[PDB]
Every structure is written in C-alpha cells, then in structure tokens.
Amino acid sequence: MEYQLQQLASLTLVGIKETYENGRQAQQHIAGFWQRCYQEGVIADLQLKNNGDLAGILGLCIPELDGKMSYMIAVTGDNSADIAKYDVITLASSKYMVFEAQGAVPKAVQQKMEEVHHYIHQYQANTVKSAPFFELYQDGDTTSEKYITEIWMPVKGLEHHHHHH
Template identity: 35%
Template sequence: MRGGRIVNYHEVSVEAITLVGECVHYETASEARRSIQSYWQDFKARGKAEALESYRNQQIDGFVGVLIPKPNDRLDYMIAVSSDQDPVEFETRKLPAGRYLIFEAEGPLPFKLREVMDAIHHDFLPKSSYNLREAPIMEHYPSGDTQSADYLSEIWIPVE
C-alpha cells in the first residue's frame, strides 16, 4: 500500500489449514483493536511464542493472528502457527478452505498493517465486486524483523 492506496494483493484458493495457538476473547472490535498489540507483547513475554514455534509446520512461515468473528460484534483473536500436531497447552482451530484475497503490508508493525486493514475495509471492499465470506480474517507475520521498513506482512480476507 502506498499513499492510502492498496497496490499489492492477489487471490488464492486454499485447503483448510490447521492452526494451533492461544485465543483471547474481546467484547467489541474496538476493544480488540486497542488490546491486540499488548496481547502479542504479553504472549511473547510469557515465553508462549517460543513454545508455539516448536509446533509449527512449514505450511505457513512464521506466526498468524486470526480474527474470528462472533455474534454481537464480539470476536476472538488467536495467535497461532500452522501445525500438524494437537498440543495440550494450545487450542486447535481450522482456517476454512476457500478463496482469500491476500493483501501485502510493507513496513514496521503494527502501524502499516493497521493502515492496510483500514484501507481494505473503508476503501477497497466497498468499491470492489468481492463479497466477504463468513470466515476468520488472518494476519500473516513471516519470520523477519517486524520493525524493518521493508518487513512484509499479509492480511488474508475471506471472499465468496
């Protein structure tokens, strides 16, 4: 994204992906938006990121943040990795098979990712012919320096 415009996205069809991780519950989307960054910091400080990484397969490189919509504007947020295992200390969920638009966000976290997410919801989707599918939205954080100006994260939006 450059100057408020989305410039890099593509469409993919994927099979279901098994994710393992830790989930928190938020009463509102605005509460989640305010709290997710501190949740990541706490998750790492508790040593959970290292523990979780040991279960990662290579289907998706790095970590993902999964926004799982719930009734009445509530949502769950899961820090996860793709995995073939079902560890006792973490939850297991499936990212449903289907079509996703994958948007690139180049720049340091969390600022660039938020900017792209806002552009997707307020500019791109309302003007596009895509219809959202009822499924989680996924943030993909590949391995690398997340504070680098050229760090490339992704947002996966489920579409019909």
C-alpha cells in the same frame, strides 16, 4: 488496490484465542496479547510447532456468534495432542484476496488494514464476514520499513463480480 488471489486447503491451527468486545479499544488489547504471548514464551513455543503450511505466525480475527470479536495468535500445526495447553482450530478451506502491508509493525498493518476494509466494501457479495481473516507475519525484522505483513481476506464467487467482466 493491489492484491494476489490465493487458495488454502483446510488447515489445522494451533495457538491461543482471546475474546474482546468488538473494539475501538480492541487494538490496545491485541497489542497487550501479543506482548503477553511473547513475554510468556508462547510465541517461541508455537514457532517450534509450525509445520510450514503457512510460513510465519498468524493473527486471526475470528467473528463470534454473540457478536464479540476474537483474536487468535497461531501457527499451522499438526496435532490435537496440544489441546491440553493450546486452542486448536480448523481453518476451513477458502480463496483469499491477499494484500501486503510494508512498514514497521503494527503501524503499517493498521493503516493497510484501513485501506483494505475500505477497498473490499465494493465487494459485499464476495467477502465472507463469518470467515476468519488474518495477518501473516513471516520471518524478518518487524521494525524494518521493508518488512512485509500479508493480510488475507477470504472471498467467495469473486470471478462473478462485474468489475472482472
């Protein structure tokens, strides 16, 4: 499978996190949460705040310590001045396997995400299950078959994996 290796410094992310039961229905709630964020002007409002650290809107999957699963819609921003209205987290610095899903959203992303998870199962000592992973949606027509969503999967110690030796 094709991927690029990328590294991020610690970043500040501003947005809204919701929490679901780890879901066979999760994708339905995530759809609804996207729909609501657009409908309520939240996406537009976050887009203003995007400081450019990452180009686009993030959909982060955040593991919770009670086993639940959170999804956060966010942008790289600057201020905890937004805490009144928004969730603000620090995305801790990490290396990533960065994959591309090309096709109309969400179908291409869902399908690519299945392939990714199956691919990365061979890298159990190198993925980081407690670290967020995310979809990155850059500017473009997400209905276009050429639209590319990036999938960022955090890794540690990947250079030691025997497949690279």
